[PDB]
Design a protein that fits this description.
part of a larger assembly; 8 chains; A alpha/beta (137); B mainly beta (99); C mainly alpha (97); D mainly alpha (49); E alpha+beta (122); F mainly alpha (86); G mainly alpha (116); H mainly alpha (116); D: 49 residues; mainly alpha; two-stranded antiparallel sheet; 41% helix; flat; H: 116 residues; elongated; binds magnesium ion; binds zinc ion; RNA-binding; ribonucleoprotein (chain B); ribosomal protein (chain B); 28S ribosomal protein S28, mitochondrial (chain B); metal-binding (chain H)
Chain lengths: 137, 99, 97, 49, 122, 86, 116, 116
RNA sequence: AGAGUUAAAUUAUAACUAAGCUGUAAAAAGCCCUAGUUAAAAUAAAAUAACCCACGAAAGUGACUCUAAUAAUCCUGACACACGAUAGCUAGGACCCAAACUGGGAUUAGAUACCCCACUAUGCCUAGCCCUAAACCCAAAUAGUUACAUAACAAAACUA
């Protein structure tokens, strides 16, 4: 059972299949986990949005959507909407650091989606645009 | 009358030179439940652990073989004028007077 | 009059100084395979001295070569090339535990 | 010695007459500078594959 | 070798690569420089998608051009190569062989710094 | 953006294990220093504060390394005292 | 202003035998055409010392130091004619001029004919 | 390894600009810091979620699903046992590391020498 | 000091999906020409390497390449000469982003403050000024010593 955590880059001749599809055809689930909200959008390999569900759309409120349960419910709703269109495996791409980071990821599993790979795509500027000033002057 | 320099030049420690990876013969003078105080004879006494093989054969006065690592463990730290002597030596157990 | 007195001579037991892995070597900006061994496969960070173990010159030379290659178009910045991913491990950093 | 060393290299330089031959020779003779290292300090090359 | 040119040409056919190399070397010789050798590094996948000449390039051929040129024509060669549509990214640097490999002496043991504070009793 | 996707910071789960895959990815990020950098870049820090933070971190790291080295050196003397009652 | 030929066959490859027997490529590579500004500075210093000084071997002499600093002063003026906003090189040129003036005063106080 | 300290502080013999500015003098103390209390985290959250799933799906009745009710109690009992026994076991032994009470006494045996 | 280049992020700009996005301890205001994904110039800045301590007289400098180049056969020495962070002024250009000020939203008895949103001068480039800092490492420059000797703290005491 030689298993490597590195992704199966299409340039190689690897033979790994999930539900009969290759790694390049498996849909993507972008989870933007902000400090006040968590937006989950399920798109296909052709970059076609299939399921979209966020904490704000889940009937929450200003401070109600900042908790991890909001991310879990948004993930459950996104998983239900994606399974309504007939998907089994999905690749989770996490964007940003927030309280609802792992809760949103586990929400898909709770709602009935299998996670095969987790990719951390967090915007890291190489000292680009100047961010806002520090709080608590 | 033999001189101190003359006897030091012929001392076994002078012939040994560096204390790195040198085979020496020591004699155990104190016994603990799991630790053995072996006096290799240079300056201090090293502390070793009783091995699983022939553990009962290690008694007080038993002679053993050692591979000496350091003659005296001293090191410097932050704000320390002098070194921190461990009052011991670093050595490992190989056998018990194989003859 | 004593012939057994110590003589002020050099130390005969002086051990050779430890060398960096690239000691007396040539570092280049075109050997992407060599340059990738010092970068993280997942993030692409350049490992420091405590991870690599290089003496004072080669660490800076490797850093400069990596920075030059990342901009000249020879080595990716965001990740390590999967072609060179199967290279022998020279760093002393372990991620998976 | 430097002048003599450069004299030998002057024969292999690229000129107007040798431009066409050198272009074709380069287009058919690839070169690689990739070589890795080990913990012992020995060089390894992928050309043995 | 004095200067080194890392020529990233657009991935094209064999005759077009030959013509591009011929004209690039002719332009380099016209500026007063003699080309020492021409080394081809092969056609590899580009590390990143390079945008040049209003074209998105995913592949490219690498070439190594070592030559001797005066210090005044480096900018003229750079400007000439900047406007070439068949060049993805031209770069002129100093050849690595002109810098002698000095003696990498090794890891000299640096002792712990002392006498940074007074002997006052705490 | 210009680089190929699903290559950097990508962890493949094994046997459907997601909780441990997330922990492995977080350990990757912490050891690469991405978590601290992201938390620091949320609000801009002035160079005067950056120099103070760097100096404080360097001093703390040196002190911790020296304390750990001394603890490891003195670990030998943790054995039971054979000369009790002397 | 001095006009060093681009084909001067600079000093590092000038006193060795067999320089004129090789083909044109070797001479062109070993000449000032492919050289940097430091080689031209060395050539100018050698040419100025061979004509102004009386003992080219006496480098520690005040006149030799004055000639060496004059070469650097001319180079700094040439650099300044191109770079107007460069302040470090302007400071270098001004302090080199001050040092040359101090050495000229010392030479005038010590040996008047050499100073003149 | 330990980062270098030469040329870091501001001293009379140091010619360069100081690199490190110590908040307090870098003297190795004779006692280590006491282990900061590891704030306890909520347990059996996953078990409670699947327990409340039965209530949400079956309109809040325990007669529909029973295993999701019994496993929640088992998790609560295991968490209580872990809170009780480990709070003593970890304070008694820390495997590789030593307790701070033993570390302080060990350091007092071989303290630092700032003076003399 | 000049010339050339951009790896990440961000944005003007188009396409699919949703009614929400941002915002805090909690809210409100603001934006719903909004948000998520796929592509995308210009401007600004230059993650890790840096646990490195180098260059420069100082201020200051660490994305890359090329050119010029870093005084003194080396004492101290001005009111003379030349520089001199950020902030500010003038003329032109640029403006993603941040933000004085200002206008709204919270808390406050009051809040013309600390919390949130929008925006200006400004931070950017060229040329010309202003010549100020906790310009501090509060320890002057040049060649030295570990002799006598702890007001206190702090970076030990001192010579010509
Ligand atoms: Mg203030
Ligand atoms: Mg300096
Ligand atoms: Mg203080
Ligand atoms: Mg300019
Ligand atoms: Mg970009
Ligand atoms: Mg615009
Ligand atoms: Mg509102
Ligand atoms: Mg950078
Ligand atoms: Mg100098
Ligand atoms: Mg002076
Ligand atoms: Mg203006
Ligand atoms: Mg703002
Ligand atoms: Mg107001
Ligand atoms: Mg503005
Ligand atoms: Mg300004
Ligand atoms: Mg100013
Ligand atoms: Mg300052
Ligand atoms: Mg003052
Ligand atoms: Mg003075
Ligand atoms: Zn080395």
């Amino acid at each position: 059972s030689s298993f490597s955590i590195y992704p199966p880059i299409p340039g190689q001749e690897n033979s790994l299949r999930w539900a009969g599809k290759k790694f390049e055809e498996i849909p993507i689930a972008h989870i933007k986990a902000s400090y006040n909200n968590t937006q989950i959008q399920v798109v296909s390999a052709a970059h076609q949005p299939l399921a979209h569900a966020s904490c704000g759309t889940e009937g929450f409120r200003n401070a109600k959507k900042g908790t991890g349960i909001a991310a879990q419910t948004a993930g459950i709703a996104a998983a239900a909407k994606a399974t309504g269109k007939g998907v089994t495996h999905v690749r989770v791409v996490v964007k940003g650091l927030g309280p609802g980071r792992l809760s949103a990821i586990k929400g898909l599993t709770m709602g009935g989606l299998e996670v095969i790979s987790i990719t951390d795509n967090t915007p890291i500027p190489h000292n680009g645009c100047r961010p806002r000033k520090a709080r608590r002057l | 009358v033999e001189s101190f320099a003359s006897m030091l030049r012929h001392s076994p420690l002078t012939q040994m030179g560096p204390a790195k990876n040198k085979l020496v013969i020591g004699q155990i003078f104190h016994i603990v439940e799991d630790d053995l105080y072996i006096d290799f004879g240079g300056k201090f006494h090293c502390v070793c652990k009783r091995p699983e093989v022939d553990g009962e054969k290690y008694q007080k006065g038993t002679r053993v073989r050692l591979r000496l690592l350091d003659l005296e463990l001293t090191s410097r730290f932050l704000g320390a004028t002098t070194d921190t002597t461990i009052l011991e030596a670093d050595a490992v157990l190989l056998g018990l007077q194989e003859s | 009059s004593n012939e057994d007195l110590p003589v002020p001579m050099e130390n005969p037991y002086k051990e050779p100084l430890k060398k960096c892995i690239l000691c007396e070597k040539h570092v280049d900006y075109k050997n992407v395979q060599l340059l990738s061994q010092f970068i993280s496969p997942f993030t692409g960070c350049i490992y420091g001295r405590h991870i690599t173990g290089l003496c004072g010159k080669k660490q800076k030379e490797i850093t400069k070569a990596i920075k030059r290659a990342q901009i000249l178009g020879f080595m990716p910045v965001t990740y390590k090339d999967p072609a060179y991913l199967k290279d022998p491990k020279v760093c002393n950093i372990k991620y998976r535990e | 010695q430097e002048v003599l060393q450069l004299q030998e290299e002057a024969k292999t330089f690229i000129t107007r007459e040798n431009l066409e031959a050198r272009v074709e020779e380069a287009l058919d003779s690839p070169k690689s500078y990739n070589w890795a290292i080990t913990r012992e300090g020995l060089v390894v090359r992928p050309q043995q594959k | 070798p004095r200067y080194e040119l890392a020529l990233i040409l657009k991935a094209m056919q064999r005759p077009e690569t030959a013509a591009a190399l011929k004209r690039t070397l002719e332009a380099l010789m016209d500026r007063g420089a003699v080309v020492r050798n021409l080394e081809n590094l092969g056609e590899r996948m580009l590390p990143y998608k390079i945008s040049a000449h209003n074209q998105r390039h995913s592949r490219g051929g690498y070439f190594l051009v070592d030559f001797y040129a005066p210090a005044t024509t480096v900018e003229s060669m750079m400007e000439h190569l900047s406007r070439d549509i068949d060049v993805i990214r031209p770069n002129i640097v100093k050849h690595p062989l002109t810098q002698e490999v000095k003696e990498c002496e090794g890891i000299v043991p640096v002792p712990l710094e002392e006498k940074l504070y007074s002997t006052k009793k705490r | 953006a210009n680089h190929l996707k699903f290559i950097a910071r990508t962890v493949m789960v094994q046997e459907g294990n997601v909780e441990g895959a997330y922990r492995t990815l977080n350990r990757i990020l912490t050891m690469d220093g991405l978590i601290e950098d992201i938390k620091r870049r949320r609000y801009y820090e002035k160079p005067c504060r950056r120099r103070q933070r760097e100096s404080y971190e360097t001093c703390r790291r040196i002190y911790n390394m020296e304390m750990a080295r001394k603890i490891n050196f003195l670990m030998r003397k943790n054995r039971a005292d054979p000369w009790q009652g002397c | 202003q001095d006009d060093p030929p681009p084909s001067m066959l600079l000093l590092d490859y000038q006193n060795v035998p067999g320089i004129h027997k090789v083909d044109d490529v070797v001479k062109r590579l070993l000449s000032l055409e492919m050289a940097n500004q430091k080689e031209k500075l060395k050539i100018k210093k050698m040419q100025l010392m061979n004509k102004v000084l009386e003992n080219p071997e006496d480098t520690s002499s005040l006149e030799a130091r004055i000639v060496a600093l004059t070469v650097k002063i001319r180079n700094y003026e040439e650099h300044m004619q191109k770079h107007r906003k460069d302040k470090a090189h302007k400071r270098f040129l001004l302090m080199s001029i001050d040092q040359r003036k101090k050495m000229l005063k010392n030479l005038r106080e010590t040996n008047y004919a050499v100073f003149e | 390894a330990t980062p270098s300290l030469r040329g870091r502080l501001a001293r009379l013999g140091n010619p360069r600009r100081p690199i490190l500015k110590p908040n307090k003098p870098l003297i190795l103390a004779n006692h280590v810091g006491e282990r900061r209390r590891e704030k306890g985290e909520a347990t059996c959250i996953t078990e409670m979620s699947v327990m409340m799933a039965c209530w949400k799906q079956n309109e809040f009745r325990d007669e529909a699903c029973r295993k999701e009710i019994q496993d929640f109690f088992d998790c609560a009992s295991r968490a209580e046992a872990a809170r009780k026994m480990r709070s003593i076991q970890e304070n008694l032994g820390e495997l590789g590391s030593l307790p701070p009470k033993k570390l302080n006494k060990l350091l007092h045996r071989f303290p630092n020498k700032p003076h003399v």
